PDB file of C-alpha atoms in Angstrom:
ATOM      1  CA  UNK A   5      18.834 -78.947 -13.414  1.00 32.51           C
ATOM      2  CA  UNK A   6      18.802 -76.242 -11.079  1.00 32.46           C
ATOM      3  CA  UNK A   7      20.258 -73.396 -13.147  1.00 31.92           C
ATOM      4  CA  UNK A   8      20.291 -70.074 -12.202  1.00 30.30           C
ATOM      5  CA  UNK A   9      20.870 -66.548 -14.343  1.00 27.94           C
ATOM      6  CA  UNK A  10      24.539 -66.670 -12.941  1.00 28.18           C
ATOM      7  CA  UNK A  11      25.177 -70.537 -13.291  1.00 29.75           C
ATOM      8  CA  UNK A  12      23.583 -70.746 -16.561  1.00 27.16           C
ATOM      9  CA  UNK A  13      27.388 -69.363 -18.226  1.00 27.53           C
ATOM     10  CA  UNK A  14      28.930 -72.499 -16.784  1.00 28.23           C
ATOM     11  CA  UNK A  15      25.920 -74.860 -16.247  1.00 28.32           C
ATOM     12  CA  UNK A  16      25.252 -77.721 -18.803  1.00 29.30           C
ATOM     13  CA  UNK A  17      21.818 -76.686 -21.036  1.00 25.96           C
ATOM     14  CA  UNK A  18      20.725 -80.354 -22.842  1.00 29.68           C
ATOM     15  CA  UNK A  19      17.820 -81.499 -20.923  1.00 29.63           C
ATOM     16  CA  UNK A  20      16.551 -77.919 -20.018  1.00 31.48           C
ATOM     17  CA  UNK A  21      12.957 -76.561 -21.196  1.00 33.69           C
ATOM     18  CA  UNK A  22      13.367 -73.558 -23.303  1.00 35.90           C
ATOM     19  CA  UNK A  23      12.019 -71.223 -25.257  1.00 40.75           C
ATOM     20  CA  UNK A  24      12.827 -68.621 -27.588  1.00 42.38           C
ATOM     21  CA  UNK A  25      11.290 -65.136 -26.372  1.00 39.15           C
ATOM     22  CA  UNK A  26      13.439 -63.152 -28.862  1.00 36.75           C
ATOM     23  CA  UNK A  27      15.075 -63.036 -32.102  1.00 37.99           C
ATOM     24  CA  UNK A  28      16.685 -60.622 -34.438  1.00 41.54           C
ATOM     25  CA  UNK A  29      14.289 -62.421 -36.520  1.00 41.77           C
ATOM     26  CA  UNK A  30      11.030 -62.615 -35.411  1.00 43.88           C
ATOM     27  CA  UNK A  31       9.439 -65.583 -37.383  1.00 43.93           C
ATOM     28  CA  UNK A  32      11.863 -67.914 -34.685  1.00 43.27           C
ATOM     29  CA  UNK A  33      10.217 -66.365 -31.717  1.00 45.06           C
ATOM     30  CA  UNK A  34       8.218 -68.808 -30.344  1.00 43.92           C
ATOM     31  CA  UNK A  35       9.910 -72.038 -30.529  1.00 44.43           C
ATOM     32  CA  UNK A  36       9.320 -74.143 -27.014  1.00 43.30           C
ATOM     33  CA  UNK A  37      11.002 -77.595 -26.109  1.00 42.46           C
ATOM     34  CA  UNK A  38      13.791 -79.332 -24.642  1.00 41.94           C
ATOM     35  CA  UNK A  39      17.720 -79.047 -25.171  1.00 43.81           C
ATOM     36  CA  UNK A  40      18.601 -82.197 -26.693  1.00 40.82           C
ATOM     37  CA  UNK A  41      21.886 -81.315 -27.801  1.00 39.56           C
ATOM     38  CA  UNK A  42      24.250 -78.534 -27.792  1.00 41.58           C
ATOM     39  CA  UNK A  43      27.466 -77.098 -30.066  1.00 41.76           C
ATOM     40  CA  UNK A  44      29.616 -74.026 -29.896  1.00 41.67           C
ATOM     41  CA  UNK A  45      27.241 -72.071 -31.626  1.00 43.52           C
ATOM     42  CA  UNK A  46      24.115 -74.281 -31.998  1.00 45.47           C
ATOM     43  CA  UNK A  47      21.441 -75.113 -29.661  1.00 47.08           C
ATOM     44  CA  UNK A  48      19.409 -78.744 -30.926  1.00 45.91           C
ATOM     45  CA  UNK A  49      15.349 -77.888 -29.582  1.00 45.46           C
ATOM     46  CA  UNK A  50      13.033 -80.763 -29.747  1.00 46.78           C
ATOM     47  CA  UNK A  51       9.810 -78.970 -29.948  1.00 45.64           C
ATOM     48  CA  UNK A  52       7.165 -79.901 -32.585  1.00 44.96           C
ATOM     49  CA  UNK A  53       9.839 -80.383 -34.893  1.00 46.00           C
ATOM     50  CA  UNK A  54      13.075 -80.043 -34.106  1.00 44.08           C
ATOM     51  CA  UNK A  55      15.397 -77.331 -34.955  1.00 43.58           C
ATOM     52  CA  UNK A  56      19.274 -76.009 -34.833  1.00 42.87           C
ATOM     53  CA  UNK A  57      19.023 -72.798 -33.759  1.00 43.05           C
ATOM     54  CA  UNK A  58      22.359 -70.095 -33.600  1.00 46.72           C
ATOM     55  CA  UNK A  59      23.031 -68.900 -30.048  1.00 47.69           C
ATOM     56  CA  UNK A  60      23.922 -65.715 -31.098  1.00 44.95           C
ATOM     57  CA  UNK A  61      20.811 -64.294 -32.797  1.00 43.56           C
ATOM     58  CA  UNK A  62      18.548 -65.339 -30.101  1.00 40.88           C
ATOM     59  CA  UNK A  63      17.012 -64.619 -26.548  1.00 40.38           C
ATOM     60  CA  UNK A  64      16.768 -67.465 -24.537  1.00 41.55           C
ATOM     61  CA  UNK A  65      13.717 -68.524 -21.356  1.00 39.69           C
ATOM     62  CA  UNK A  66      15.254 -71.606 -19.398  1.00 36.83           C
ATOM     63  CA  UNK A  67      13.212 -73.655 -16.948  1.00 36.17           C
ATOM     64  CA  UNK A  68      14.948 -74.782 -14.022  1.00 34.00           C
ATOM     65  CA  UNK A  69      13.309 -77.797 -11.946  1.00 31.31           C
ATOM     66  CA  UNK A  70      11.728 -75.388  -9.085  1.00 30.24           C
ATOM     67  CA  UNK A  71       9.811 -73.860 -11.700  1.00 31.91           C
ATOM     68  CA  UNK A  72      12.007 -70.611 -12.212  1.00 33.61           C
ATOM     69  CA  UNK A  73      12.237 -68.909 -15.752  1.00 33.52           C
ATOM     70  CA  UNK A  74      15.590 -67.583 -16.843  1.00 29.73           C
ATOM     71  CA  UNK A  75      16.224 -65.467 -19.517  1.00 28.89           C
ATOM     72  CA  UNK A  76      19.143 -64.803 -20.999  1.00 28.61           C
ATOM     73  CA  UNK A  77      20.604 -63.263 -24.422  1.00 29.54           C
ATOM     74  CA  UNK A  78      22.094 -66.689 -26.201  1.00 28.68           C
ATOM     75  CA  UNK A  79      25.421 -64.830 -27.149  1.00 29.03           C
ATOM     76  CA  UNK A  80      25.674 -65.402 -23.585  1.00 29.38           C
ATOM     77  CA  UNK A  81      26.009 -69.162 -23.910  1.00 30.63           C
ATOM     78  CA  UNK A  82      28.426 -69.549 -27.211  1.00 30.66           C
ATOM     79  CA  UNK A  83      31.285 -72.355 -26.844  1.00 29.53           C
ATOM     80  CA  UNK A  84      31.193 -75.533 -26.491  1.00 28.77           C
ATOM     81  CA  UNK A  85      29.456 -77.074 -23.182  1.00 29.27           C
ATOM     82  CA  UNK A  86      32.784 -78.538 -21.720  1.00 30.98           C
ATOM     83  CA  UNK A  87      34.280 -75.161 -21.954  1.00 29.55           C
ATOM     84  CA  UNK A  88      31.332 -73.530 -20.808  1.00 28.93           C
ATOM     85  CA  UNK A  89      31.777 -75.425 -17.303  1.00 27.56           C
ATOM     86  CA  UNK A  90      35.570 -74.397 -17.402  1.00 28.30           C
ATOM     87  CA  UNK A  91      34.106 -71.269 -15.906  1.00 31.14           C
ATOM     88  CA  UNK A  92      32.714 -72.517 -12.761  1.00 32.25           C
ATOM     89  CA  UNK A  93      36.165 -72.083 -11.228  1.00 32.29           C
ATOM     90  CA  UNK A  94      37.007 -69.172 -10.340  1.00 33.22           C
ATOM     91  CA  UNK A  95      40.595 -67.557  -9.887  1.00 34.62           C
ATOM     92  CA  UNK A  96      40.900 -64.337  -7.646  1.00 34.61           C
TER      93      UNK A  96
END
């Protein structure tokens, strides 16, 4: 939807256009598609084929709907999605 670098920690990811712009291994980089599924340290890509690629290896490019490329180191995103969003609220 309409992520944003800062949302992105908190903001759900299936559904998302992404693509992998780095790796610590490069064969990976490369792989385009949608999130169709995410774990605590998995993200599910629907591309050609579809693979289960480790959040904490990669370099993520999200698409939000205006258009608007994120990147974003994956070790970023590790945890599950529902406590992800746990980190929308803030406590000051």
């Amino acid at each position: 939807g309409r992520v944003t670098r800062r949302n992105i920690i908190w903001h759900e990811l299936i559904g998302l256009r992404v693509r992998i712009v780095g790796s610590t291994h490069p064969a990976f980089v490369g792989i385009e598609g949608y999130v169709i599924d995410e774990t605590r340290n998995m993200l599910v890509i629907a591309g050609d084929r579809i693979w289960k690629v480790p959040k904490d290896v990669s370099i993520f490019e999200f698409e939000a709907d205006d258009g608007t490329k994120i990147k974003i180191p994956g070790e970023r995103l590790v945890g599950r999605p529902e406590m992800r969003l746990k980190k929308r609220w803030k406590k000051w």
